[PDB]
Design a protein around this ligand. Structure first.
Ligand SMILES: CCCCCc1cc2cn([C@@H]3O[C@H](CO)[C@@H](O)[C@H](O)[C@H]3O)c(=O)nc2o1
Ligand SMILES: CCCCCc1cc2cn([C@@H]3O[C@H](CO)[C@@H](O)[C@H](O)[C@H]3O)c(=O)nc2o1
Lengths: 810, 810
């Protein structure tokens, strides 16, 4: 049908068809009179997976003979979403399968909707890992994703009376065709025990054994025939385990609980044992697998020339003392040499500065669970602090601030400090985030080893985030400048000469118009809710957090409402405000925000006076596959975190690529996006990082804003008095209370500038042509935000390998 | 190679080869440089399963249009063993796959050894169900096996210092190619709750829901292209289940524990909740599935003309009040009519008279767990007792004996009584067992409804128990009389005219000689133990029970030893005594017997004087696939239960079919085997049922035997004094104590007659030719003991359907 989707060969269409019928019959054991769409989804998924394997096997083979340096991406999160379309796209099968399935009298699009998301992540950090995997394959790196195969991923969110209900994501219920169990590479992981000292050195003994079984999932490069591996570990109990009899067998579940469920906070840090066991589990299994692969090439000097280990936040920080443990206790290298090898292997990526997000494990936990790792850690600390002392003699304060060991009512290990000490590179995820790292929380460490600190601004993959979710726009781009930009997104910069082209302007607008219409229909079919598609689509999607300030959005929305009710017969640019995201289950405030959002909807969507001029929708169950639908349909992208809190953001980049304009603060990667497009083509408002520090150091008094802004005063009053909760008048007292007395995120301080900036957005929207020309300037300068750029920078500046765009043979 | 194994076509061999390589590559994702035999086993298993499916689908289709009466075989046990060879055999692919795998440079026999047993049963009752399934398919009945898919089957037995250790049977670890998950037919099962009464009748409410997910496994008929289904249910928790968050997800395991593990007693009855939940679980899911199938043909009058439900012991007895519950509470038929439908649907098979094996559920358990089923049961009891009262007016004793409700310190429901009241036929499993039923435990019930009581002597399938495990003998039979006997085992009777044929005599002996040599090699390779293959192979294999009297065997073995040590220079016919079987984990005595057996081995196998004249081996991990090896290699089959305790036995039949002679008591099916072969061709010794009753009614005093038999006195003394346990002299005090003061099974009373009969066996063995002629008379009269006969009798006399031997089209 459309050309970016590949060739529909006459042979290809014919083979696809017989293979689809083979799987229906042999694999699924159905015939065409009993098959449901689920069966049809499966036969198609099996048919496409068939095309992967030859490549998968050939790619693993290449790495064996070439023996290149290997990259291990360690993460507790992989937010993959659906696999089928992405696979078709990277293999250039999309059009063929469309044809092939059409002639069988099926609608492929309807089949795609049947696939469960692999929701093995919470948000940005999980999804980065997924983009990175796609980019790594596409750039021909010999790279492995390693994580945990959670039986249950991020919970499905239901709204019941405006409240979030959590229910379990049973994503494997119907099976998962993409994975291949490999019970033959199962590995022991040890816990508890104690440490004995010999003549021969330390020994870890009387441990409980949990087995780790890997599952391999193919990660196909973009049209280069590279297929890399994502290996995910599953917990199994051993057979003699506990081994009255019945109970012993049932208790096998204690061991297997390790891989049962993904922890769903991205707000906070909970010092729960189960979580630490998951962290140790992925790191022990992964390192033995790494070492094993290294042995099949005594000599650990070359180890850093063959192995690179990237740590995605501190979650797998135990890789460091675990690598030491192996090298020292098992291979019997001396400390200094093992330590050299470890630092040259490991590198660390930080994703936040919020102090409550930092991992600080209680020492009593590590002592019971990992007694040897604590020994190694104390030894790491001691030797590190002697370097500190020697470089800053007499500075006893530096020494307490820099310790990997925090004193206090309970001793904790600061995991971030561990990663800096034992890594050769530490990076932030957007330029301002990396500066803040150097100037505030890791200032001491930076003064000690400035060479360790780097920046790697995040990106998103344009395969999923443009070609896949937005074929219309990818096609009209490709009409003008070719297809080469799909793996070289810098070429989008050539759309700049199309800024005054009348045909392009019309086409860009037409695609947006189509995505809006299609999404509005998705809204009626799947959730029975009813929106004007001529309105501006104002969307905020992302996890619910105080620092992301969905509340600031709420205050605007309430203001628009109030101004409509004051002069109801005046013209306003109509808007559909859509807000979505999950709250971590125990994050009370986050759950209150979701309730407010639906409560505003109950009032605004049912005022006869408001008409279809304002609508407030809370988008239920935000997740990767919902983002693929809502992002292309958006006009306004809301990125309104308080300056200095959002490390990078990546949602922001998805929207830029897809033809929304951005209203946002100079936070995170927003800064670089505006720098790339021109501040004129951006809606920037509010405090800069500096303004926030000025406010802090004199004190944030929220009362001041309440006193000078009558529009604001009114809103707080409606909140307090029961306007939005007529049955429980005091429902929102916590929010009003927080906003007034202990807002760490200064919602009121940005309110005035935000509302004004919002009026400027409405003003540009009244002029369709000028709105679209601005869109074009945005879409055209989005090239920097490809994860191909990001990964190429990691590769050269941290891992020491060279990207390759060259096809492997089919 | 050999002709019973089918054609090696040139096309067949060629297709098998490409399909094997397709699965290796596409399904297993290996290539020939990394594949292990496990991978090779799998590609072959996938290749053979391919040949099933077309037939599986076509067979289900036939039943849809023909709409015949359907048989549901309900059992908590299916002791299947390996599937691959059996599948090849029934499909006539054996020789082709042998050829096909030979040309790939693989040894198929070595690949077969990789398949795990499906050990979803304990012993005879589980394995009967499996034979029955094969026979049902072979006779073209539209029959379904229904059970539970246990995650862990019967434990693997390890001997450690002569003691049984149990370890978990993780049979699904590497996957199971034979099954097809069907998450689309998942069904709710309810527990707990309470009963509300309406104007509209009873309602069961506030229940916990556990979902039951079915797995379908193909059951292929013998060369008739019929493929029937074994459906096994798996427990899954619902998604809103319990639904702080983490714990709620982890607790999903409480619900799923229902299908986690098979209970391993066949001795006793344990009134454990988990077990009752398994019983309810299989019965609720199965009946809804049955009813659903019946609805796709309001009118439940035809229900008994369309549905037959066979209950394998009382384990699924709740089918009865569950069928009532559905019919009365959900479909709103009146009681009398539902009850009529239920009785005409259900039939019951009893497998023992031992009072401690009988299910008697505590009323407090049923009240909490299944409150409505208890109501139905009380109503069943009441209406039943009015029939009793009316037929035997004034007999208040009959009334207490017949009640489904037993009074006593705790009230119990007697599940056997339930099955008789609510079934149109009750059967025993061998002729003497059925008489005993009528004369003792169900005498009252028989007087009430004599027409309900029938006999169905057990059988074994000659596909697994001859063609598969003993190709040598099947071939030499087939040389003389054709292949038709494989599904008409009565034809073996024609071997009677070959009794004086010198060539046959030589061939029968040669095959036995080959199986012995091959098994002796299996003994050295896999368990490093070392046996003279010219000895008589004396084997007792079966679960360890006091009533099966492995102890009586021990006393013989100790006697042979003692006589050798008295006159060491005299000739004795050398013997290898082999004894194997598992003990239920909490059955202390059973575990003591295993220890004695190995302890006798520690003495006898290391006496220089004994030489290779006596050897005692305990065969570890007895299970279906070990039986396939040891049975064909045996000379003497030991079936030495006390008269009146072994309901039928089926091991006994396997040995008869495979050329062992039988030493046994007139117990169970032994009686009919000797009746078929002639008592002259059998080694019968000991008390008859009648003799046991005479001994009881005057009192069994074991001291009497100890006083008059000095050979016996000696053994007890060696036992008591530490002869067989020099380090713990008092180790066996429990056994000596039981034997002397409270032997319920009268081991001493049969000792004299057994030892004498053993001398007669040794005497015949000195004359090879006459031994073999007797073997031939045994093998030749084994036809009655085919499960084809048995199932044909069930079909005509209980289910009311006609067997069909006619091929379905390929
Ligand atoms: C037990 C630990 C629980 C809390 C730790 C945590 C930090 C954090 C950061 N980010 C995002 O990581 C994204 C990828 O770098 C980035 O774009 C976003 O700015 C950043 O907020 C994220 O998505 N989730 C994370 O959870
Ligand atoms: C919770 C309940 C636990 C104990 C109930 C039980 C009875 C019983 C009978 N049989 C055999 O069933 C075989 C099949 O009929 C038969 O040949 C054997 O003679 C008979 O002993 C068996 O194998 N296992 C059974 O367990």
């Amino acid at each position: 049908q459309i050309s970016v989707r590949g060739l529909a060969g006459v042979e290809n269409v014919t083979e696809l068809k017989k293979n689809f019928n083979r799987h229906l019959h042999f694999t699924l054991v159905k015939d065409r009179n009993v098959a449901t769409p689920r069966d049809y989804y499966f036969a198609l998924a099996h048919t496409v997976r068939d095309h992967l394997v030859g490549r998968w096997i050939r790619t693993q083979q290449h790495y064996y003979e070439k023996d290149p340096k290997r990259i291990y991406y360690l993460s507790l999160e992989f937010y993959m979403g659906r696999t089928l379309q992405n696979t078709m796209v990277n293999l250039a099968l999309e059009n063929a399968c469309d044809e092939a399935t059409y002639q069988l009298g099926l609608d492929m699009e309807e089949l795609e909707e049947i696939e469960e998301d692999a929701g093995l992540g919470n948000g940005g950090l999980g999804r980065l890992a997924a983009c990175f995997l796609d980019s790594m394959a596409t750039l021909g790196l010999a790279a492995y994703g390693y994580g945990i195969r959670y039986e249950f991923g991020i919970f499905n969110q239901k709204i019941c009376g405006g409240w979030q209900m959590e229910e379990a994501d049973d994503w494997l219920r119907y099976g998962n065709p993409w994975e291949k169990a490999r019970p033959e590479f199962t590995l022991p992981v040890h816990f508890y025990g104690r440490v004995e000292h010999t003549s021969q050195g330390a020994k870890w003994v009387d441990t409980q054994v949990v087995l780790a079984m890997p599952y391999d999932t193919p990660v196909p490069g973009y049209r280069n025939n590279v297929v890399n591996t994502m290996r995910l570990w599953s917990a199994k109990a051993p057979n003699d385990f506990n081994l009255g009899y019945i109970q012993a067998v049932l208790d096998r579940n204690l061991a297997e609980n390790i891989s049962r469920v993904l922890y769903p906070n991205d707000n906070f840090f909970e010092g729960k044992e189960l979580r630490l066991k998951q962290e140790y589990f992925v790191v022990a299994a992964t390192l033995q697998d790494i070492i094993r692969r290294f042995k099949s090439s005594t000599n650990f000097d070359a180890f850093p020339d063959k192995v690179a280990i990237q740590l995605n936040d501190t979650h797998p920080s135990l890789a460091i003392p675990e690598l030491m443990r192996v090298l020292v206790d098992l291979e019997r290298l001396d400390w200094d040499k093992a330590w050299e090898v470890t630092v040259k292997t490991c590198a660390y990526t930080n994703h936040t500065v919020l102090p409550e997000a930092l991992e600080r494990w209680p020492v009593h936990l590590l002592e019971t669970l990992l007694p040897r790792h604590l020994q190694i850690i104390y030894e790491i600390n001691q030797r590190f602090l002697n370097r500190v002392a020697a470089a800053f003699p007499g500075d006893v304060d530096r020494l307490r601030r820099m310790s990997l060991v925090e004193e206090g009512a309970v001793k904790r290990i600061n995991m971030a400090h561990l990663c800096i000490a034992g890594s050769h590179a530490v990076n932030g995820v957007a330029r301002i985030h990396s500066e803040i790292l150097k100037k505030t929380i890791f200032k001491d460490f930076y003064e000690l080893e400035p060479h360790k600190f780097q920046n790697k601004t995040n990106g998103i993959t344009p395969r999923r985030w443009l070609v896949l979710c937005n074929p219309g726009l990818a096609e009209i781009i490709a009409e003008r400048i070719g297809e080469e930009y799909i793996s070289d997104l810098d070429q989008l910069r050539k759309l700049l000469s199309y800024v005054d082209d009348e045909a392009f302007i019309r086409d860009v607008a037409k695609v947006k118009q189509e995505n809006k219409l299609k999404f509005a229909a998705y809204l009626e079919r799947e959730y029975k809710v009813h929106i004007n598609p001529n309105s501006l689509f104002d969307v905020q999607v992302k996890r619910i957090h105080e620092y992301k300030r969905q509340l600031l959005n709420c205050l605007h929305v309430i203001t628009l409402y109030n101004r409509i009710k004051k002069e109801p017969n005046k013209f306003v640019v109509p808007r559909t405000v859509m807000i979505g995201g999950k709250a971590a289950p125990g994050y009370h405030m986050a759950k209150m925000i979701i309730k407010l959002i639906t409560a505003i909807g109950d009032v605004v969507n049912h005022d006869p006076v408001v008409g279809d001029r304002l609508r407030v929708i809370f988008l239920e169950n935000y997740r990767v596959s919902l983002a693929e639908k809502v992002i292309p349909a958006a006009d306004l992208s809301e990125q309104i975190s308080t300056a200095g809190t959002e490390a990078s953001g990546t949602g922001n980049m998805k929207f830029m690529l897809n033809g929304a304009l951005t209203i946002g603060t100079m936070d995170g990667a927003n800064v670089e996006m505006a720098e790339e497009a021109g501040e004129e083509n951006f809606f920037i408002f509010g405090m800069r990082v500096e303004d926030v520090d000025r406010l802090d150091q004199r004190g944030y008094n929220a009362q001041e804003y309440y006193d000078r802004i009558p529009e604001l005063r009114q809103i707080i009053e409606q909140l307090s008095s029961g306007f939005f909760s007529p049955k429980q008048p005091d429902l929102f007292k916590d929010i009003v209370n927080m906003l007034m007395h202990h807002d760490r995120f200064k919602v009121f301080a940005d309110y005035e500038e935000y509302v004004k900036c919002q009026e400027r957005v409405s003003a540009l929207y009244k002029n369709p042509r000028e709105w679209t020309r601005m869109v074009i300037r945005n879409i055209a300068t989005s090239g920097k935000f490809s994860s191909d750029r990001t990964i190429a920078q990691y590769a050269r500046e941290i891992w020491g390998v060279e990207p390759s765009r060259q096809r492997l043979p089919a």
